[PDB]
Amino acid sequence: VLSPADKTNVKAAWGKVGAHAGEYGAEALERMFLSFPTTKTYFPHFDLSHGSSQVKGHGKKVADALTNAVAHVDDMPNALSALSDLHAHKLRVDPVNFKLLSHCLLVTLAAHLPAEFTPAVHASLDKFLASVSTVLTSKYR
Amino acid sequence: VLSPADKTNVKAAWGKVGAHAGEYGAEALERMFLSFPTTKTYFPHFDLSHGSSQVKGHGKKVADALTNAVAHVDDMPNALSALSDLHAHKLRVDPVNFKLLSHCLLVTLAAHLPAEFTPAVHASLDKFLASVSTVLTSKYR
Amino acid sequence: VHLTPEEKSAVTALWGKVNVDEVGGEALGRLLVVYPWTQRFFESFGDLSTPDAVMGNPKVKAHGKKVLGAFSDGLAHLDNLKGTFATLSELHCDKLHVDPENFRLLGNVLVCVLAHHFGKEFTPPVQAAYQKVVAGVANALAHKYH
Amino acid sequence: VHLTPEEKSAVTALWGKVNVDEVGGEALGRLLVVYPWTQRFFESFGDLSTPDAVMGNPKVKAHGKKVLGAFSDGLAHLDNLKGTFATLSELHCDKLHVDPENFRLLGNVLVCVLAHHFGKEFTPPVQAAYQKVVAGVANALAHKYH
Numbered sequence: 001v002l003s004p005a006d007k008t009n010v011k012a013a014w015g016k017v018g019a020h021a022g023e024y025g026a027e028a029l030e031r032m033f034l035s036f037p038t039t040k041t042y043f044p045h046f047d048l049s050h051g052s053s054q055v056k057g058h059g060k061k062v063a064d065a066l067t068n069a070v071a072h073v074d075d076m077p078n079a080l081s082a083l084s085d086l087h088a089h090k091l092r093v094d095p096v097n098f099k100l101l102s103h104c105l106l107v108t109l110a111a112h113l114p115a116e117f118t119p120a121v122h123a124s125l126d127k128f129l130a131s132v133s134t135v136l137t138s139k140y141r
Numbered sequence: 142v143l144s145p146a147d148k149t150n151v152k153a154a155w156g157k158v159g160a161h162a163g164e165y166g167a168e169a170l171e172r173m174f175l176s177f178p179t180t181k182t183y184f185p186h187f188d189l190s191h192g193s194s195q196v197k198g199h200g201k202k203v204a205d206a207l208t209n210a211v212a213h214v215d216d217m218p219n220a221l222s223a224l225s226d227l228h229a230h231k232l233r234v235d236p237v238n239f240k241l242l243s244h245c246l247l248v249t250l251a252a253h254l255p256a257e258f259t260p261a262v263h264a265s266l267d268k269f270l271a272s273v274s275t276v277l278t279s280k281y282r
Numbered sequence: 283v284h285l286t287p288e289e290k291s292a293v294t295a296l297w298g299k300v301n302v303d304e305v306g307g308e309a310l311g312r313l314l315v316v317y318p319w320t321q322r323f324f325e326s327f328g329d330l331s332t333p334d335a336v337m338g339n340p341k342v343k344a345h346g347k348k349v350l351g352a353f354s355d356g357l358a359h360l361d362n363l364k365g366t367f368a369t370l371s372e373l374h375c376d377k378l379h380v381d382p383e384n385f386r387l388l389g390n391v392l393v394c395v396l397a398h399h400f401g402k403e404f405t406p407p408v409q410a411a412y413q414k415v416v417a418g419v420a421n422a423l424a425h426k427y428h
Numbered sequence: 429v430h431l432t433p434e435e436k437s438a439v440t441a442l443w444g445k446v447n448v449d450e451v452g453g454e455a456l457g458r459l460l461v462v463y464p465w466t467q468r469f470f471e472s473f474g475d476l477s478t479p480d481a482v483m484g485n486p487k488v489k490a491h492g493k494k495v496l497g498a499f500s501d502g503l504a505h506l507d508n509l510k511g512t513f514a515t516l517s518e519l520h521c522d523k524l525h526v527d528p529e530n531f532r533l534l535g536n537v538l539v540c541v542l543a544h545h546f547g548k549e550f551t552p553p554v555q556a557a558y559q560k561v562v563a564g565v566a567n568a569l570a571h572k573y574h
């Protein structure tokens with residue numbers, strides 16, 4: 001669980017993402033769509049081609065929610081409350097899907113932060129994504 | 142997550158298990174060992190044959206911990222604290238293993254409570270086991 | 283998916299006793315109730331708001347029977363689950379895009395349904411045997427993803 | 429495990445550039461750090477108390493290289509991952525009893541290691557391609573469980 005060093009590690013890595021959080025959000029989406037084709041089934045309404053603005057715009061929304069979790073690490077349940085009701089009841093996202101996106105999100109950070117994606121950071125970040133996943137699937141859970 | 146009807150459903154099903162909680166614990170162990178051979182790898186020291194007392198005795202310990210979770214549903218993290226440190230650090234139980242045992246535990250209740258293992262109960266009970274699982278793998282988590 | 287003669291008996295013998303008309307919908311309904319994301323696959327089936335609504339849903343009852351046939355037909359082609367399931371895999375993979383994990387879920391709920399129904403007959407060994415089969419089918423069915 | 433010509437290039441080309449001596453231990457060490465239950469598999473390797481201890485551990489470094497060879501050798505037998513991995517499967521399944529889920533974990537950490545190392549070259553498509561392979565190997569390796 002998010003020990004104080006974890007807390008520290010995430011804030012630290014989140015920090016060096018800064019103004020590109022949104023862009024990284026998009027990239028992570030793109031990665032998911034291609035490596036995990038089945039996930040495309042939740043976005044019938046979108047153009048999933050490279051440069052889709054639908055995707056870019058949805059990448060800032062993803063980045064916006066992780067930023068709020070990061071800022072309220074110690075109380076994510078409450079903060080992501082809203083988002084849980086949406087992914088759980090509205091959409092019925094299959095929980096496996098949460099791990100595929102956490103996975104593409106790690107692949108993008110590793111791709112953008114050679115300095116900072118050290119083993120301890122990775123581990124911490126992995127642990128953060130599992131917690132957000134766990135919250136987004138709390139209706140079910 | 143454990144809504145009030147869930148809370149109700151579990152207490153209800155736990156209630157009709159009564160004096161056989163321990164015996165059901167054993168049976169559930171036996172089931173796991175046979176259907177999921179790989180799990181046997183955490184009990185080198187045990188005789189996993191049918192009538193093993195090692196297994197019977199370990200079935201009462203399993204049943205004893207679920208009884209305490211049931212009784213402190215609303216605050217399992219704290220109550221299973223101890224047990225978490227043991228399955229996470231001491232033993233390094235692979236988390237997949239948690240689902241296999243929740244699975245055999247459901248198969249045993251269904252086998253012993255035809256009346257009560259209705260679809261809503263099952264669902265509730267499934268949800269309870271996931272929560273205990275989630276707690277026992279909190280070190281990792 | 284070897285399965286010893288002793289496990290081969292456990293298996294057909296009890297299946298001998300199975301309600302083909304009932305259990306199929308018992309299994310699928312339980313699926314939808316227990317892991318409701320799965321309900322995204324049968325929105326067309328009608329009312330699924332609650333367990334009561336789910337379990338009487340005749341579309342659930344109907345579809346359940348075809349699913350068991352598919353297990354029966356698998357239970358009879360064990361050394362060739364790929365061929366025997368080619369058709370369905372393509373269906374579940376290329377059209378429907380179902381995550382393979384749900385095939386494990388259905389087989390496990392299927393085992394819970396058989397324990398429920400057989401009781402004291404569904405001994406550990408019989409289960410061990412059924413787990414094998416069920417493991418088989420989910421793999422046969424996910425075959426088209428690799 | 430078809431893989432189009434276009435995906436076949438993505439793949440060997442970058443692997444062309446891979447540090448065979450380094451990355452193997454980068455991957456295995458990361459495995460042990462990120463999902464520490466896995467540390468129950470190499471208690472014999474020595475000091476694993478922390479990430480620093482894990483990552484310099486020469487036993488980790490050594491074993492990592494054999495594991496990559498195994499991927500390389502797979503990357504060269506794609507249309508026959510079962511045969512090519514027969515030996516190892518039996519090793520990971522019948523002796524060691526490793527849950528198949530950890531083969532997915534290693535392949536994913538392996539992809540994170542390649543992204544880390546290649547950056548901007550590890551485009552979405554290259555990843556999509558690598559994911560395929562990795563999916564292949566884990567299935568080849570779990571082959572002995574069904």
Ligand code: HEM
Nearest residue numbers: 039042043061062065066087091093097098101132133136
């Ligand atoms: C780390 C986990 C994730 C977070 C933080 C997250 C965040 C969000 C946010 C902030 C929204 C609302 C954006 C808006 O209001 O349009 C949303 C919607 C949505 N999410 Fe997620 N999401 C996550 C994972 C996933 C997964 C795993 C899936 C499915 C594979 C998914 C599918 C969707 C869909 C289908 C919608 C509605 C999209 C639309 O209609 O435009 N999300 N998500």
Ligand code: HEM
Nearest residue numbers: 180183184202203206207228232234238239242273274277
């Ligand atoms: C629902 C989840 C579970 C609960 C409530 C639970 C409960 C317990 C309890 C109460 C103990 C201590 C008994 C004593 O003090 O001897 C224990 C020990 C142990 N558990 Fe679990 N357990 C669970 C799941 C598992 C799983 C999934 C595994 C591995 C597959 C596992 C393997 C072990 C082992 C190896 C020990 C030490 C046994 C010994 O040395 O005698 N348990 N468990």
Ligand code: HEM
Nearest residue numbers: 320323324348349352353370380384385388389419420423
């Ligand atoms: C190992 C398990 C499974 C077996 C043996 C199986 C078998 C079948 C069969 C026999 C059909 C009938 C196709 C037709 O309508 O002729 C079918 C269709 C269908 N399957 Fe499954 N299935 C399995 C798992 C799943 C799961 C887990 C889901 C979703 C969570 C699912 C989603 C669907 C849907 C939505 C249809 C019906 C619409 C249509 O295809 O006409 N299946 N399946």
Ligand code: HEM
Nearest residue numbers: 466469470494495498499516526530531534535565566569
């Ligand atoms: C797809 C992934 C994997 C590949 C390609 C792979 C490959 C290998 C190779 C090449 C060896 C050397 C056997 C020898 O020592 O000659 C080996 C051994 C070993 N594997 Fe893996 N492995 C994989 C995943 C795993 C995982 C995930 C674990 C545990 C979590 C594991 C546990 C072991 C252990 C403990 C040994 C070494 C002791 C011995 O066998 O001498 N392997 N593996």
